[PDB]
Amino acid sequence: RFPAKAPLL
Amino acid sequence: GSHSLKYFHTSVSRPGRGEPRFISVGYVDDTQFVRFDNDAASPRMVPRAPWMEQEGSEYWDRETRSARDTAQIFRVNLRTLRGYYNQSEAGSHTLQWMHGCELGPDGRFLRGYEQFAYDGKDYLTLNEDLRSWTAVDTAAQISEQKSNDASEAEHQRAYLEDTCVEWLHKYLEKGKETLLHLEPPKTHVTHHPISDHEATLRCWALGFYPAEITLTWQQDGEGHTQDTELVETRPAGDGTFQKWAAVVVPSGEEQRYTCHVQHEGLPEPVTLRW
Amino acid sequence: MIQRTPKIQVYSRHPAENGKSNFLNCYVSGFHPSDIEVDLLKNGERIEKVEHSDLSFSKDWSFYLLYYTEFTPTEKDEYACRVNHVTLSQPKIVKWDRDM
Ligand SMILES: [Zn+2]
Ligand SMILES: [Zn+2]
Ligand SMILES: [Zn+2]
């Protein structure tokens, strides 16, 4: 399942 | 057997052309099952394995929304990183993200992964404890500090330990006859003379799944060393893999050389001569 | 800005047999950046409906792609792969050998 978000870099 | 759910994300900037190109693929072990490519009018998550084309539209709508938002986050990140590195907006840059969870033989969570890469090099890596980061430079240390202030590693850990494990079990159930199926390699040796006194013995391993395999050439006796040419494991295009290993032997001395193949689909290793 | 040169394998899905249908594969891997030009050649000429896998990458962040087309090997047809990339000083051409 694709993550809901990705970390902000 | 152990299993893993992994996703691989790629974002490439297009200077002067608007939105960056985003491509994302998901794998269960060595089986790709989903893909998202934002190069379309309204791009959607689509199935890339037969056992995934029975899923309801609620799943695909949810994955399409998640993939679209991550694409937007990567658009911000590409801009942020070219700020850190003082790079012009005319150059193309790549941001890659891979994450995943791995189950042990008991079916329980064992390990999680997450890593970021900018322009092909490591950038930010989540450590084995899933609690700390490892930065490769001052620019990635700002990224690490932002994540630490927002407890981001706790958010990624929760996804890796809970969401990823729960859905990996679901995927392993829907594709039970294929994902849990081991495909043994089909093996044979070929003979190709280099000169009057030398020849090549090429040991083939064809049509196996998963891709993990070991090919070695052995010679009768002990203390021997073989200079083995070994090709990278390659996809057959049907879901299985191929590999071969070659060794140069003197002519007439072929029968004293032996190929040994190890694979999870082999109850015992197989042995081959020519 | 690391740049990696592509590794190339040209091979068939099944062991070749003249007059019998098969699949010709060009496997390209270990390259960075992602953009790459891969063409399958039949007797020097470009085949026009070639399908390729979806972009993925290895543990070292380098990309890999499979390019494939249905084909029927013969004793007289020579097949090859033409690959060009930013890391290459000239396009690389690899001939299909049914023994590799
Ligand atoms: Zn968060
Ligand atoms: Zn089978
Ligand atoms: Zn000689």
Residue numbers in the entry:
A (entry chain P): 1 to 9
B (entry chain A): 1 to 274
C (entry chain B): 1 to 100
Paper text:
Human leucocyte antigen E (HLA-E) is a non-classical MHC class Ib molecule homologous to H-2 Qa-1 in mice and Mamu-E in rhesus macaques (RM). HLA-E exhibits preferential binding to a highly conserved set of nonameric signal (VL9) peptides derived from the leader sequence of HLA-A, B, C or G molecules. VL9 peptide-bound HLA-E complexes engage the natural killer (NK) cell inhibitory receptor, CD94-NKG2A, thereby protecting healthy cells from NK cell-mediated lysis. Whilst VL9 peptide binding and NK cell regulation are ostensibly its primary function, HLA-E, and its rhesus and murine homologues, can present peptides from microbial and autologous sources to CD8+ T cells.
Reflections from multiple isomorphous Mtb44*P2-Phe crystals were merged and integrated by Xia2, producing a dataset to 2.7 Å in the P1 space group. Superposition of Mtb44*P2-Gln and Mtb44*P2-Phe with the original Mtb44 complex structure revealed similarly orientated peptides in the PBG. Perhaps unsurprisingly, considering its depth and hydrophobicity, P2 Leu to Gln or Phe substitutions were tolerated by the B pocket with minimal repositioning of the pocket-forming residues. However, the P2 Mtb44*P2-Phe Cα atom is elevated 0.7 Å away from the groove floor in the direction of the α1 helix, relative to Mtb44, permitting accommodation of the larger aromatic side chain. Additionally, P6 and 7 of the Mtb44P2-Phe variant sit 0.9 and 0.8 Å deeper in their respective C and E pockets, in turn reducing the height of the P5 kink and increasing the P5 buried area 40% relative to Mtb44 and Mtb44*P2-Gln. Such features align with single-chain trimer-based transfectant data demonstrating that Mtb44 P2-Phe drives the highest relative levels of HLA-E surface expression. The hierarchy of tolerated residues is consistent with our structural data, with P2-Phe up-regulating surface expression of HLA-E to the greatest degree. Notably, Mamu-E restricted Mtb44-specific CD8+ T cell responses in BCG-vaccinated macaques were preserved when the animals were challenged with mutant peptides harbouring Phe or Gln at P2.
